[PDB]
Structure 1
């Protein structure tokens, strides 16, 4: 229970990233695929913390 609290910051960081994707896509809509190509790069690079916080729960419960 106390271990999975850290997904709060991961969810807030992804919400900031995908709100910034909207405010960047509305700042130059002709580049609205390269900015998503950066957003998915940041998303796939911040899910390392998500798999950290999802396997530390399985490190203590069943290992």
Structure 2
């Protein structure tokens, strides 16, 4: 059927948001390394900010996987 074929190609075109989310995680976790090299004694506060911003940017990896699930299973 075309009704499920469109679901599968739309969910395939819907996970392209994860490319930009992974690029954001990569630049942010690289800045964690650079910031821990800059101010080495406050490194654990920087990993705290790293995990905070990780949980705040994964929310739209989860806001695109939600749209993927609504395409395939709703």
Instruction: Name the TM tier (shorter chain).
Output: over 0.9
Gaps of 5+ in 1: none
- Provide the TM-score with structure 2 as the length reference: 0.83
Aligned equivalents of 1:50, 1:6: Cα separation in 2: 7
- Provide the TM-score with structure 1 as the length reference: 0.96
Aligned length in residues: 63
Matched, 1:32 2:43: yes
After TM superposition, where is structure 1 displaced by more than 2 Å over at least 4 residues in a row? none
Gaps of 5+ in 2: 1-11
Aligned equivalents of 1:51, 1:57: Cα separation in 2: 10
* TM-superposition CA deviations, 1:10-44 (whole Å, max 9, x none): 00000000000000000011011000000111001
Matched, 1:46 2:57: yes
Please state whether the residue corresponding to 1:32 is helix, strand or coil: helix
Alignment-derived partner of residue 14 in structure 1: 25
RMSD of Structure 2 on Structure 1 (CA): 0.5
